[PDB]
């Protein structure tokens, strides 16, 4: 069916996204990017581990779909459905073309499928869990990385959950009560805005 | 057999091997094309110098 990924492994062409010009593309393999309990708040799953891609390439939509489900089946069977949140951190926006008596006369091809362009040191997947339960995710990402063409690491990230705040700083800011907990995110507070819009106990310089 | 060909390859070399000939800058620069309202006056004064 679909061509080998070696044909569409290197970036050789400028990005060719769906628009008022690239139309007739099919919808990509992947339609869901966040799986597991995506409703849990910041304080529940602190530990976060990412599958990071280490070579510039085109990970196909089919690959980046099959990888998440291979990272989900393991996590579900072992550590239960209520202890991980998976997020695929890349979207298939590049549209691959295929060209198929008549030779290369009129050689521009009709669109084939859709793939996501990655780069050196680009986070590709993330799982968030509880440190007591982190080993399962550590192995699940390793079990999913044999679905991608290049080299990847399985790197725990120094920050807290999916938030821009390190573990140390976020715990400092929780004890200082200078952070709004939003759900999966959090927001620092500070010295800008109107004094009015702040809650009575949430005023800082 | 593709009769359509195009390069600028070697054209900078042909241009520069005999210099990019700048025109000799001139005392008494040319007036052709200038504003006829200005030039009629300019001529008429030189008609009536002493």
């Amino acid at each position: 069916g679909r061509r080998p990924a070696r044909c569409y492994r290197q970036i050789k062409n400028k990005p060719y996204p769906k628009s008022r010009y690239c139309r007739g593309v099919p919808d990509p393999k992947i339609r869901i990017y966040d799986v597991g309990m995506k409703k849990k708040g910041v304080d529940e799953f602190p530990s976060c581990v990412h599958l990071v891609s280490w070579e510039k390439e085109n990970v196909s939509s089919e690959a980046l779909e099959a990888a998440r489900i291979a990272c989900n089946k393991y996590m579900t069977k072992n550590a239960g459905k209520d202890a991980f949140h998976l997020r695929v951190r890349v979207h298939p926006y590049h549209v691959l073309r295929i060209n198929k008596q008549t030779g290369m006369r009129g050689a521009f091809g009709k669109p084939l499928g859709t793939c996501a362009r990655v780069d050196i040191g680009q986070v590709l997947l993330s799982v968030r869990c509880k440190e007591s339960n982190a080993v399962h995710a550590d192995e699940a990402l390793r079990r999913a990385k044999f679905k991608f063409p290049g080299r990847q690491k399985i790197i725990r990230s120094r920050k807290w959950g999916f938030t821009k705040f390190n573990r140390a700083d976020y715990i400092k800011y929780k004890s200082e009560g200078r952070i709004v907990p939003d759900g999966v995110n959090a927001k620092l507070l500070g010295v800008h805005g109107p004094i009015a819009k702040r809650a009575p106990g949430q005023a800082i310089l | 057999a593709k009769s359509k060909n195009h390069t600028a390859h070697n054209q900078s070399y042909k241009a520069h091997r005999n210099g990019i000939k700048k025109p000799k800058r001139q005392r008494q620069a040319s007036t052709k094309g200038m504003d006829p309202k200005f030039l009629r006056n300019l001529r008429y004064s030189r008609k009536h110098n002493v």
Binding site: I195, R198, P200, G201, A203, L205 | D35, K37, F38
Partner: protein, 273 residues
């Protein structure tokens, strides 16, 4: 209310538009001198009417800003003789005459360009006869609708009657016959010498005595009946042609008190509730 992207993409217009005071499409066209004249500015005859004055100026355009050489107001007419009714058609006539006389006296060509010694409505242009061309100005109404009868065009008539050259035509002088397409000498004469207030003073005085008193108080208390308007304007025009010559707002409170007051509001809000 207006969102952040609105503010960030907003382009402000020119200050003298956000105040709604200038028409830049007119201004470019009035000030723009041909580039083969190189400096000779186009002097604009700028007349403006407030509710209680008739300002007039001769101004030219400079990079630094417009530079005035003769300013003539209606509130300097009392020094000449007109004490009441200083923003009417004839008052703007007098103000135009005064400004033209003063430009002439400042550039010293009045004696060769005296204009009409006496006002008339029949349209006036000067002979540029010999060696001295008249001072040439460009009238600038501003935002007013140039309808027939406008005080601006009374001021135009006065500026000409002083001797200035301002390109013009009689299609907006008061009393133009918009049907028949010529002026009436007598009706423009009436407007210039204040007939149009004189007949309304008589009209109120005949069958409206209470509005006459509530409506022309200053005319009353300066004792000027509708009977004495023309000759009054004769004398004021003669005077014009003969003699053309601590803290209450608060300081911006500075950073130290600002920062102290801020922590005070902060402690109030935080400690409370």
């Amino acid at each position: 209310q207006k969102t952040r992207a609105y503010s960030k993409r907003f382009q402000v217009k020119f200050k003298r538009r956000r105040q709604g005071k200038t028409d830049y499409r007119a201004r470019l066209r009035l000030t723009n001198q041909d580039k083969n004249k190189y400096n000779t500015p186009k002097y604009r005859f700028v007349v403006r009417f407030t509710n209680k004055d008739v300002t007039a100026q001769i101004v030219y355009a400079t990079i630094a800003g417009d530079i005035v050489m003769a300013a003539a107001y209606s509130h300097e007419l009392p020094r000449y003789g007109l004490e009441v009714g200083l923003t009417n058609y004839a008052a703007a006539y007098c103000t135009g005459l005064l400004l033209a006389r003063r430009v002439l006296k400042c550039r010293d060509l009045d004696q060769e360009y005296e204009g009409n010694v006496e006002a008339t409505g029949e349209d006036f242009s000067v002979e540029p006869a010999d060696e001295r061309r008249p001072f040439r100005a460009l009238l600038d109404v501003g935002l007013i609708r140039t309808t027939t009868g406008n005080r601006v065009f009374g001021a135009l008539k006065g500026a000409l009657d002083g001797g200035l050259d301002i390109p013009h035509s009689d299609k907006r002088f008061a009393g133009f016959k918009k049907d028949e397409k010529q002026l009436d000498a007598e009706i423009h004469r009436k407007y210039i010498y204040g007939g149009h207030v004189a007949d309304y003073m008589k009209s109120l005085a005949d069958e409206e005595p209470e509005k006459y008193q509530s409506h022309f108080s200053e005319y009353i208390k300066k004792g000027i009946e509708a009977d004495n308007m023309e000759a009054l304007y004769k004398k004021v025009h003669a005077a014009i042609r003969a003699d053309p010559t601590k803290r209450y707002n608060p300081k911006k409170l500075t950073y130290e008190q600002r920062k102290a007051s801020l922590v005070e509001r902060l402690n109030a809000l935080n400690s409370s509730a």
